[PDB]
Design a protein around this ligand. Structure first.
Ligand SMILES: Nc1ncnc2c1ncn2[C@@H]1O[C@H](COP(=O)(O)OP(=O)(O)NP(=O)(O)O)[C@@H](O)[C@H]1O
Ligand SMILES: Nc1ncnc2c1ncn2[C@@H]1O[C@H](COP(=O)(O)OP(=O)(O)NP(=O)(O)O)[C@@H](O)[C@H]1O
Ligand SMILES: Nc1ncnc2c1ncn2[C@@H]1O[C@H](COP(=O)(O)O)[C@@H](O)[C@H]1O
Lengths: 407, 412
């Protein structure tokens, strides 16, 4: 059915392999490879019918599947989303390019990072800015932390320690007309019931491996942004910045898309995030990492986490650079729609044509398909380009009109 | 009415200080220390708590008030905590005492993220710090394949609790009895046909709710078992001392574990391959932001290889040794001096213990800066009473030691 993984096909060059647990719209590779201007027939897709997990990566059936392509391993490398211990061993076993930071990974190092607990710890000691927070160690400590952090704003967040996308986050409100981007539920504050309120907070966001909870002052932000980086033994190249776009608030806020150069890239954001990033470079992580953060109306800057993995808009950025150019951000803007009424790639391309906004190499304007049927923003996932923000906004509203969204 | 293991830290005391102990001090022991030290004894007080120094007590309103009574308005005062927990940092605030350096780091129990064995394997492996082959084991099957792969090189694997200390969480695995395992509690023979339950025996006993990691490593025989202690501030990571870790000598018996019995300081393990890597590792943890005392353990191989085992963001053991050394012989004491502790003297009343040294001819002579001093009269630090011996000469100091063992007996 779904093709939420097909999107990573845009990372592809001649000779490459993609691995998906999903399906591909039969047309989606040729289309992607025609757009990317590469030899479709020189590009492979190896499907599993079960999720892409550690067990798979260790599984030699799985392993020899890849060894068919890599054969000797010479001139082959692995391009993992999460530089896991199995992923390193997979480079070991295939005789493939050694993973960078191999040893950090072999000690499951990339899993200390990708904890919200580790983040605050690291950012307190370093001085990187943080909302007032507590790394909760149990329901008792969860109860106190809300009794204090509720007061500045009337708003508080509770994050499961290992999690992504805003999925392990519950908010705490003193006002039903407060909206919480990056939460799942939102529960109302209640002085007379907080022992019970931290209970439901404990049981829902802790398990056997995760016994730390974070609880922060939630702040209403004027800019919800993040920065994605690439790391090696020499440097951390700043890759890009984007905007976490939310909605579901009419008078809780679900994620809906990403937007191109963030309107948030000054020193007070770049410099503290860059310093933190390098310290992580120092402790060993080799690869892509991104740092979430906000900017407030008054001006205070805050950071939430690093995820040592593909930001999830890395694909957006790759696409832009492969279509528009290394420096694309200077004169271009991209933006992403989800919940587009899904359909065949053919039926998708026609509405984009019927709307007048299909990607068009001449202008550098228009939209491309990253999935006809995905779960991430359940719908078809599009990416749209424009030298002009206002044009981009019209083009999207057309794709609404012509192709159809779901509410 | 029991152990005085806490009483050793009276030797940090200066004028007007307060030491907090859950313990029992020989009622003569304070005055002996201040005396030997030269402090105004009636200035230093000792506040006995009837419970361990738990986070709840640091937060106990009566405990803090009883601390306020001495701290006054905080002005002049600082906290001198072994472990900069969160409750520690919060104490300095409600007593108006000077802020704990690294406050925010502490406020996030950073200290606790450090101090995990798994953490150390991770950071060092990322940094480059020499490690022994090993694995952060997420479960018992992992433990199985680790013991299976890691047993060969030396025939000895070690297995440790993620958050523990004093060699209490380390379980040895041996393919031969006649294995000496410094830094472990028990040693188990590795059979092939019982590597199954081996692995789940270790898993079940070295984990709990809050710990789902077990460290598994190649255990090496070693020319020297050392560590280096540092002090940390915003400006500099500060080298304090190096020290030799002394473990029990087993009569080549089918027992494996060698208990820890003492500490020799001006160590013979300070060169390029131990210092500089350790240096690099310690600076980064200053980058991440720990503030205070920390130490890094390590071994040097018969063939000259080096490996580091862990850091502890807290007082090492030998910090009181080093301290007292500084206070009695001076800052740059390691140039011309040596010291060595003892853990297993027959415990005794202070007067008697002081008789023995005199009888042995080695009670610390202020005039010559030579001889021994009591650190506790009945401590459970390993064995029993703890003493610390000084000399400008290595052989003389040893000769003083067995004099003491002859004179005051030992619990071996
Ligand atoms: N776990 C511990 N065991 C024993 N003593 C401890 C422990 N943790 C802290 N202490 C003692 O607690 C005291 C902390 O010092 P504190 O109570 O703040 O006043 P002070 O520093 O001694 N006096 P001053 O700094 O000169 O004004 C020191 O005596 C430490 O030795
Ligand atoms: N893999 C190993 N190979 C060889 N010797 C080891 C190994 N691991 C530990 N040791 C030795 O055993 C001791 C055990 O201490 P360690 O492994 O650092 O944990 P620990 O008990 O927490 N140390 P500490 O808290 O300072 O008492 C070390 O000081 C070394 O002497
Ligand atoms: N833990 C994971 N989370 C998300 N995607 C994953 C994960 N593991 C594997 N994948 C998929 O497998 C590829 C990268 O593998 P990995 O490095 O294990 O994330 C991408 O196609 C991902 O969609």
């Amino acid at each position: 059915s779904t093709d939420t993984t097909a999107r990573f096909l845009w990372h592809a060059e001649d000779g490459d392999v993609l691995v998906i647990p999903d399906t591909v719209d039969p047309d989606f590779p040729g289309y992607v490879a025609d757009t990317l201007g590469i030899d479709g027939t020189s590009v492979h897709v190896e499907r599993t019918q079960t999720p892409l997990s550690e067990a798979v990566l260790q599984d030699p059936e799985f392993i020899d599947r890849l060894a068919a392509h890599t054969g000797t391993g010479a001139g082959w490398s692995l391009f993992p989303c999460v530089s896991t211990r199995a992923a390193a061993q997979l480079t070991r076993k295939l005789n493939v390019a050694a993973l960078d930071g191999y040893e950090f990974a072999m000690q499951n190092g990339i899993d200390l990072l990708n904890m919200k607990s580790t983040f605050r710890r690291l950012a307190a000691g370093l001085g990187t800015p943080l909302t007032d927070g507590v790394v909760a160690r149990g329901p008792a400590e969860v109860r106190s932390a809300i009794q204090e952090l509720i007061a500045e704003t009337g708003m508080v967040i509770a994050k499961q320690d290992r999690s992504g996308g805003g999925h392990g986050n519950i908010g705490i409100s003193t006002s039903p007309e407060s909206s919480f981007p990056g939460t799942r539920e939102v529960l109302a504050y209640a002085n007379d019931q907080l022992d019970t309120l931290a209970d439901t907070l404990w049981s829902q966001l802790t398990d056997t491996q995760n016994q730390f909870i974070t609880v922060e002052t939630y702040h209403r932000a004027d800019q919800r942004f993040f920065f994605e980086y690439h790391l090696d033994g020499d440097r951390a190249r700043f890759l890009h910045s984007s905007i976490l776009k939310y909605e579901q608030l009419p008078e809780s806020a679900k994620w809906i898309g990403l937007d191109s150069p963030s309107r948030s890239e000054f020193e007070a954001t770049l410099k503290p995030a860059e310093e933190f990033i390098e310290m992580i470079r120092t402790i060993g992580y080799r690869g892509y990492v991104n740092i979430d953060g906000i900017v407030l109306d008054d001006g205070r800057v805050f950071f939430h986490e690093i995820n040592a993995r593909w930001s999830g808009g890395l694909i957006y950025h790759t696409v832009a650079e492969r279509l528009l150019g290394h420096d694309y951000a200077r004169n271009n803007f991209f933006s992403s729609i989800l919940n587009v009424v899904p359909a065949g790639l053919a039926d998708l391309l026609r509405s984009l044509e019927r709307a007048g906004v299909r990607y068009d190499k001449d202008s550098g304007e228009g939209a491309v398909v990253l999935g006809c049927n995905s779960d991430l923003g359940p719908g078809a996932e599009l990416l749209v380009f424009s030298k002009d923000w206002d044009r981009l906004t019209a083009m999207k509203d057309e794709i609404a009109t012509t192709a159809g969204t779901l509410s």
